């Protein structure tokens, strides 16, 4: 089978299958030139982030293919992918943001969507002060502006 | 380390788009100016909250919302715009200024002038939902206001009249008035329970002929062969022929859409039903052969269709994309011989299956369905006399890898204890559940994923045995819906003081409740000796609701049919006033204005509304 190597920003090299690397639209794009065989360089991805990225991609392509196969009562991975996605996203905030940035770089739509939804779920059920504390955001709203925004928000059924 | 705010604006918009809960959106809009702009440019759905008299103070910040819901504006059901009012047209202009990007609209259509003034404000509108529970205004001809709407809503792709009261003669006349409007329709929802009689065969034929490009068709029809013009064999053939591109076909008898189980259950009806509908298996084969793109099928009839197994076998081959099936009073669903699968058991692509009133269904048939439909995630069975906890448990074990939403209702041999025992294999996996609170049926343990429980109970019965029935440890149970039905004009006064809502204190995460007592029939004020009036029944059912830490409550007061009132009483309002934790409270009925002033005493109560969403809605407002 065709295999490709990816070079992280810190010089590390990861050897992986071509098909799983095809998930990243950016990598698929640089495939067009000679760097497909000379080694695709990723100046904006670190070793740990790249390892997490190709782990997620490998699991998705595998279970994908796995589901491309099987005969009856065997797609139970669908939940597993989920359950595995849920336990995979149990990472610290900094690694989460780096994973988001790497997904935006490599243009892996599924991973980017999953990480953004993880952030959105982290948002749910928190007051503005709680959100500011969790994400370290400074409040630039004057009290009059806060009351105006609240008055606007009173026009929406909750 | 990188913080969230240093992320690119595209990523921030993607993150904000994932916040679907409106409260969290309101919270996030207050974090900072950048977050305010992101939330306002990202919000897509808005249900307008406020008073009609305050429409001039309408906010202009929601410029990106594509779905607008104007049906819940206060006072509920009031004409949003009246032609008699001189500055009515300005109101429409205001709306177009506040929400210029609306493509989906839901409005209350009490007055035709409201439609004529509001709907044409968005020429790019593609989905429309009309709501009306009040009486249909008198018109010279059928479909006059619908014809007006068609005139001002040319580019509409979806029309939703499932909560819009009108005569069934209105729809075909309006559709045939303008062929180009009907040709552009992709979805047509006419599944209205409030229709006195469903669409006739000729009306169905005209509707389907007018709209050839429908992907979704839902309608409440007249399938009872007693009446003249009942929908039958030719209506189904015409539906199949005229709309080959249907992806969803939901045809139901009007009585089947009623909330009261006495209206569709053949046992509860006093000899009604029990006869064959004018539907044959061969014609069902013909219809299913003509709908290759079908993905959802629902045929909920109030009359019997027997030996339908061969017809359902054709569904597996001729409808590869079929994932959901809902059948009502279809017989011969699964009649396995030796080990061969047949009928609905052949449909291996089913993800949801609803079964109602199948006399032939035994334990062997249920196990055959479980074997053949190995992909079932939702299963619903109603009124099957011959099925037993053995067969239901075997089916649950066979489907333990996918089954997450189970409903067992009106099963003679399956009570509350029986149902909870039968759901043992999926006890740790089931997420949504419905059981009937039948306590007199003659016969580790943690519900880890159970998030929603639906209960049906007869009037005068207690809720206390529920924990003894098997629903002991439900850590994740957040929402419970209780429906009470029965005629208490013949019931004696109960010997116990309270219904037993305090039993729900056994579940720590319970925060949302639906208490639907609207199908209780009793005496408003003049209960004879040995009986109690509706206020006393409201006390009996609502005692202890204050001790529950509920944040949302939907309550349906019991109704007196003779006086035609669904009123919230003094004792019931006093009991509801004890709920200090309520965030949202919706009463489906009428109440005195002092009663509504009572509830504003609650500090955290944000959304309060009296919603008479039943037919006919009171005109006293």
Curated annotation (Swiss-Prot), chain A:
Residues 100-158 are annotated as: Interaction with the F-box domain of F-box proteins. The keyword Nucleus applies. It is found in: Nucleus; Cytoplasm, Cytoskeleton, Spindle; Cytoplasm, Cytoskeleton, Phragmoplast. The keyword Metal-binding does not apply. It comes from the Eukaryota. Accumulates only in meristematic cells. Expressed in inflorescence, shoot and root apical meristems, as well as in developing organs such as gametocytes and seeds. Also detected in cortical layer and epidermis of roots, leaves, pith and vascular bundle of young stem, young floral buds and organ primordia, pollen and through the valve of siliques. Not detectable in mature root tissues. GO terms for cellular component: cytosol; mitochondrion; nucleus; phragmoplast; SCF ubiquitin ligase complex; spindle. InterPro entries: SKP1 (IPR016897), SKP1-like (IPR001232), SKP1-like_dim_sf (IPR036296), SKP1/BTB/POZ_sf (IPR011333), Skp1_comp_dimer (IPR016072), Skp1_comp_POZ (IPR016073). Keywords: Auxin signaling pathway, Chromosome partition, Cytoplasm, Cytoskeleton, Developmental protein, Ethylene signaling pathway, Host-virus interaction, Nucleus, Ubl conjugation pathway. Pathway: Protein modification; protein ubiquitination. Pfam families: Skp1 (PF01466), Skp1_POZ (PF03931). Its main location: nucleus. GO terms for biological process: auxin-activated signaling pathway; chromosome segregation; ethylene-activated signaling pathway; jasmonic acid mediated signaling pathway; microtubule cytoskeleton organization; negative regulation of DNA recombination; protein ubiquitination; response to auxin. Involved in ubiquitination and subsequent proteasomal degradation of target proteins. Together with CUL1, RBX1 and a F-box protein, it forms a SCF E3 ubiquitin ligase complex. The functional specificity of this complex depends on the type of F-box protein. In the SCF complex, it serves as an adapter that links the F-box protein to CUL1. SCF(UFO) is required for vegetative and floral organ development as well as for male gametogenesis. SCF(TIR1) is involved in auxin signaling pathway. SCF(COI1) regulates responses to jasmonates. Part of a SCF E3 ubiquitin ligase complex composed of SKP1, CUL1, RBX1 (RBX1A or RBX1B) and F-box proteins. Belongs to the SKP1 family. This is SKP1-like protein 1A. It comes from Arabidopsis thaliana (Mouse-ear cress).
């Amino acid at each position: 089978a065709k295999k490709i190597v990816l070079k992280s920003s810190d010089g590390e090299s990861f050897e992986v299958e071509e098909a799983v690397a095809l998930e990243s639209q950016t990598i698929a794009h640089m495939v067009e030139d000679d760097c497909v065989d000379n080694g695709v360089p990723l100046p904006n991805v670190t070793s740990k982030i790249l390892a997490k990225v190709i782990e997620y991609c490998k699991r998705h392509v595998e279970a994908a293919a796995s589901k491309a196969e099987a005969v009856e009562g065997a797609a139970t991975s669908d939940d597993d992918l989920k359950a595995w996605d849920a336990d995979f996203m149990k990472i610290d905030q900094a690694t989460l943001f780096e994973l988001i940035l790497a997904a935006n770089y490599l243009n892996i739509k599924n991973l980017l969507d999953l990480t953004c939804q993880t952030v959105a779920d982290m948002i749910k059920g928190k007051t503005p002060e709680e959100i500011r504390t969790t994400f370290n955001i400074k409040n630039d709203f004057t009290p009059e502006e806060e009351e105006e925004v609240r008055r606007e928000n009173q026009w929406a059924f909750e | 380390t990188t913080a969230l705010n240093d992320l690119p604006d595209v990523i921030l918009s993607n993150i904000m788009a994932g916040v679907s809960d409106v409260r969290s959106r309101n919270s996030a809009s207050l974090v900072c100016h950048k977050w305010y702009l992101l939330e306002r440019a990202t919000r897509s759905a808005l249900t307008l909250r406020g008073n009609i008299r305050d429409l001039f103070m309408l906010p202009t910040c929601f410029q990106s919302t594509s779905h607008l819901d104007l049906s819940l504006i206060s006072p509920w059901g009031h004409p949003l715009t009246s032609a008699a009012d001189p500055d009515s047209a300005l109101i429409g202009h205001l709306l177009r200024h506040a929400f210029p990007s609306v493509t989906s609209l839901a409005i209350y259509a009490r007055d035709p002038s409201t439609i004529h003034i509001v709907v044409p404000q968005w020429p790019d509108l593609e989905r429309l939902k009309l709501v009306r529970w009040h009486q249909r205004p008198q018109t010279d001809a059928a479909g006059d206001e619908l014809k007006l709407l068609i005139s001002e809503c040319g580019t509409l792709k979806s029309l939703d009249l499932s909560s819009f009261y009108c005569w069934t003669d209105d729809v075909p006349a309006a559709l045939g008035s303008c062929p180009t409007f009907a040709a552009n329709l992709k979805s047509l929802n006419l599944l209205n329970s409030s229709f006195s009689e469903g669409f006739k065969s000729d009306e169905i034929k005209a509707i389907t002929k007018a709209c050839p490009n429908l992907r979704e068709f839902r309608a409440s029809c007249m399938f009872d062969p007693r009446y003249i013009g009942h929908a039958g064999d030719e209506a189904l053939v015409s539906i199949s022929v005229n709309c080959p591109k249907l992806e969803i076909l939901h045809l139901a008898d009007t009585n089947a859409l009623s909330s009261a189980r006495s209206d569709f259950d053949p046992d509860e009806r006093e000899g009604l039903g029990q006869e064959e509908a004018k539907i044959n298996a061969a014609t069902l084969i013909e219809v299913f052969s003509g709908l290759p793109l079908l993905e959802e099928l629902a045929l909920d009839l109030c009359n019997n269709v027997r030996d339908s197994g061969p017809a359902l076998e054709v569904l597996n081959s001729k409808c590869p994309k079929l994932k959901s099936v809902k059948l009502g009073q279809f017989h011969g669903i699964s009649l396995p011989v030796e080990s061969k699968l047949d009928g609905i058991a052949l449909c291996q692509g089913l993800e949801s299956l609803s079964i109602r009133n199948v006399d032939d269904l035994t334990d062997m048939g249920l196990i055959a369905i479980g074997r053949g439909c190995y992909r079932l995630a939702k299963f619903e069975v109603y009124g099957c006399k011959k099925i037993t906890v053995r067969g239901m448990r075997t089916m649950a074990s066979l489907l333990r890898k996918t089954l997450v939403d189970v409903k067992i209702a009106a099963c003679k041999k399956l009570g509350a204890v029986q149902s909870l025992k039968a759901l043992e294999p999926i006890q740790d996996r089931v997420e949504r559940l419905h059981i009937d609170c039948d306590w007199d049926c003659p016969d580790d343990k943690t519900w880890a994923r159970l998030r929603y429980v639906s209960l049906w109970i007869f009037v005068g019965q207690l809720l206390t045995p529920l924990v003894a029935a098997g629903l002991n440890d439900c850590p994740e149970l957040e929402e419970i819906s209780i429906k009470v039905e029965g005629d208490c004009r013949v019931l004696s006064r109960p010997t116990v003081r309270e219904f037993g809502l305090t039993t729900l204190l056994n579940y720590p995460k319970l925060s949302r409740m639906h208490l639907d007592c609207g199908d209780i029939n009793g005496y408003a004020h003049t209960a004879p000796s040995g009986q109690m009036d509706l206020s006393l029944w409201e006390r009996f059912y609502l005692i202890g609701v204050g001790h529950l830490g509920l944040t949302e409550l939907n309550y349906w007061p019991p109704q007196d049919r003779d006086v035609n009132q669904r009123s919230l009483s003094l004792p019931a309002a006093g009991l509801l006033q004890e709920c200090n934790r309520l965030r949202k409270l919706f009463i489906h009925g009428t109440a005195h204005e002092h009663f509504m002033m009572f509830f504003l005493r609650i500090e955290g109560l944000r959304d309060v509304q009296l919603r008479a969403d039943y037919y006919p809605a009171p005109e006293n407002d």
